[PDB]
Amino acid sequence: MERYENLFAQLNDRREGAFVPFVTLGDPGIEQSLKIIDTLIDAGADALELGVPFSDPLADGPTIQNANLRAFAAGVTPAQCFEMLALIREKHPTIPIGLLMYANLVFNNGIDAFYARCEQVGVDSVLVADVPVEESAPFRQAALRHNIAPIFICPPNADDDLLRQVASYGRGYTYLLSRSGVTGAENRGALPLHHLIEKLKEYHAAPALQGFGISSPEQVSAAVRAGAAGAISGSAIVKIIEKNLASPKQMLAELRSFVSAMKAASRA
Amino acid sequence: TTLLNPYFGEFGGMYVPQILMPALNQLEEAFVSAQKDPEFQAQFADLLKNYAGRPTALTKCQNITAGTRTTLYLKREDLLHGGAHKTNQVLGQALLAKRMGKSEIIAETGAGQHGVASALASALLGLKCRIYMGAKDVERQSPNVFRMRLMGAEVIPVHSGSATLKDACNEALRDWSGSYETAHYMLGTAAGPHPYPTIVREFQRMIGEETKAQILDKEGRLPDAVIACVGGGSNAIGMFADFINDTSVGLIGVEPGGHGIETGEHGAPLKHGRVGIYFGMKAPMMQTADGQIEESYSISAGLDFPSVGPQHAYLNSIGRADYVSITDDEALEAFKTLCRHEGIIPALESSHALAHALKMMREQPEKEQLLVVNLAGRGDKDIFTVHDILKARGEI
């Protein structure tokens, strides 16, 4: 499948940026997580980034650390995550679905087999947060064999060699990292990224999605204005879940208002 | 791209977020440069000798082997400033931080000994030290926490995950991911992403180098085997390194068997775990069937870690080094035995090593063998633990 390629072409036709929320699968539970995800899509999500709960999410700040913990509190396992992914795809044929993985979950039962399962359930991309380009070969190979886009991080501390590597190896989208550190809405990126954006286009990289610290509409508009194809927001979304655990109804309503606002900022 | 091989065979690597790769590259270059720098080496040697007290004794233990053909020496890392071998490599890594122009130190600790070592080195060398420690560890290790704080270190409890060593390990990397521009991560064992397994080995190798010189002086030959406990692997690889090419010398690493391997409550991933990728490295892990990092267990906090350094996994694979386990009860016996018969109170960690040496002796008491146990730390820290156990089993 070419889900990201199709999404970007359509968005380019509408001169819109992509807005892509991240959530943790199964936070705060399987049924609620399925409803959260449907709400995000209904509210205007162009694509999804979906975390499989992992014991040691060392690229995540406390907000997403806690999402993982809430999912584990609910008994969520990777196999249950794959069931959820199959059902999400069964409901929603075209939306790009990216997973946010940690290496051990991918390697556990065989890297090839992991990517084959992703293909079977209809996942579009995999980002392995603790695998740098330097260690990426078996992951990117298995991804491509199974029609999965391997997502590469283009960090703010990147050079020409790395830009060329991520442009060459990556598919689907290039993850344009906002700043150093870990995920969290509590820290906004303070670096201009248009230079990196331009070089990626020069090297024919997969379209750039800016991520880390995106929590407001202005930032989505800013990402598009800088030449990125769109923006990813996780912690900000997960904070709404965290805030509204006691009111599943209100949770969905706020998620809806938030995504609508963020998406609106991408069209213009 | 690196200067040195990040792998030992299939084990090791640099499994960190992309954002941290320049930090690892910077540290490797600084290390490689420092190893060629006589000025660096002289400053390191000066701290080792005049501050930490190297060389450490090699003690012949005659009472505990009486009636057998075992000759047993203990390498006395217990006598190093701080009370454990951890001090050696923190001094080197603190100098590396300075070489790189870094002003802050991050460190993980579990039992607290590495944190104390990091704190003392930071005090001495004028680095601002923050230590991450799982909150369950903070709760259990009030003495070490206080030692660290007396020495000016910030101790930060880690409440995520299982609130233990692995979680502290992650938190340290999380901090570093954002602060590497000013801070050095002073990892406390021969594990984690390259170049740490290599650096920690090289900054611990004086253990084995001294042992070799001392045993040639006292016995006229190399040991038949050198024996060390394996938590993450630093004291063991420090003892083993200089003997690796001496193929007649056995290298025995002792993992904690906890309540017994069959119970699953142990810390012996090298022999009873499964290869995984965590903490920046591909190595044997204790993990669930679906690949979550499992909880280890040992009576001894210093060994209670669900993975192991990649060089140990490699040396095992090729049959150069052999790895065994020792249970809580065996370690406790060895502790009591050394106190009563040699007047040395060993750390419960190194009591695992001693227990295995005692088994080698007792199993085959007419076998002539010259053994060295790395006594990696003193057991002052463990006396409350042992008391509580000894009274509860009714030796009161």
Ligand SMILES: Cc1ncc(COP(=O)(O)O)c(C/N=C(\CNc2ccccc2O)C(=O)O)c1O
């Ligand atoms: C006296 C003594 N003797 C042996 C050991 C075992 O450690 P080894 O010699 O490195 O195998 C310790 C380990 N102690 C730890 C754990 N240190 C630790 C363990 C695993 C990962 C990260 C760590 O900081 C600490 O944090 O202090 C010790 O204190």
Ligand SMILES: O=P(O)(O)OCCNS(=O)(=O)c1ccc(OC(F)(F)F)cc1
């Ligand atoms: O909005 P924030 O700050 O919570 O960021 C959301 C990020 N969610 S994600 O799944 O894209 C994502 C992407 C990359 C991550 O680590 C890595 F860069 F090291 F690979 C972690 C999470």
Ligand SMILES: [Cl-]
């Ligand atoms: Cl916020």
Ligand SMILES: [Cl-]
């Ligand atoms: Cl090399």
Ligand SMILES: [Cl-]
């Ligand atoms: Cl190998």
Ligand SMILES: [Cl-]
């Ligand atoms: Cl390899």
Ligand SMILES: [Cl-]
């Ligand atoms: Cl030199």
Ligand SMILES: [Cl-]
């Ligand atoms: Cl000299």
Ligand SMILES: [Cl-]
């Ligand atoms: Cl205190």
Ligand SMILES: [Cl-]
């Ligand atoms: Cl910080």
Ligand SMILES: [Cl-]
């Ligand atoms: Cl010599």
Ligand SMILES: [Cl-]
């Ligand atoms: Cl001589």
Ligand SMILES: [Cl-]
């Ligand atoms: Cl052998």
Ligand SMILES: [Cl-]
């Ligand atoms: Cl778990």
Ligand SMILES: [Cl-]
């Ligand atoms: Cl061999």
Ligand SMILES: [Cl-]
């Ligand atoms: Cl007695």
